[PDB]
Amino acid sequence: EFSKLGLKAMDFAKAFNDRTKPHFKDDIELIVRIQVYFDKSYIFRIEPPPTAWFLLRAIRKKRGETGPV
RNA sequence: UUUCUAAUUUUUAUAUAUUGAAGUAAUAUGUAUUGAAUUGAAUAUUAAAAAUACAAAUUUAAUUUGUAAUUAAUAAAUCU
């Protein structure tokens, strides 16, 4: 999606990992809110995992096991 | 229809518009869950969960963008 706009996202991933590689239990899928301005300069907030991710952990169920009745 | 006359029924009757409301804004459970190659309100089914209002769409292979934001607009007042 950067390359749709010509941005070598090989950098952002590093700027991401400049903030997310430590601090974190392994395999914690975070949400990134990338926001691209008319100058193409992005600004991104990292956010705790989606609560649906939390919920399946706290009950120990994989994808497809849970459902509305 | 005796004849002159008089008379109250007439190839004259009323027809649906004012307004291509189109500016006013970044986000935040959430890309719910399931079924799914994929689906993020806009595949399929499923629809009474919430909170700090905007899930019956367009759009995209998916999203984001981008259109859209429940409003003044009184023909009725017979025309004879």
CA distance A7 to A10: 9
Asked whether residue A6's C-beta has any atom of DNA/RNA strand B within 7 A, the reply is: no
Residues 16-55 of A with CB under 7 A from strand B: 31, 33, 35, 45, 47-54
Strand blocks (E) in chain A:
31-36, 42-47
Burial class of residue A54, CB neighbours in 10 A (0-12, 13-18, 19+)? exposed
Asked whether residue A63's C-beta has any atom of DNA/RNA strand B within 7 A, the reply is: yes
Distance A42 CA to B28 C1' (A): 18
A55 token code pair: 């919920």
CA distance A48 to A1: 22
Show Cβ contacts of residue A30 under 8 Å, excluding neighbours closer than 6 positions.
A20, A24, A46, A47, A48, A49
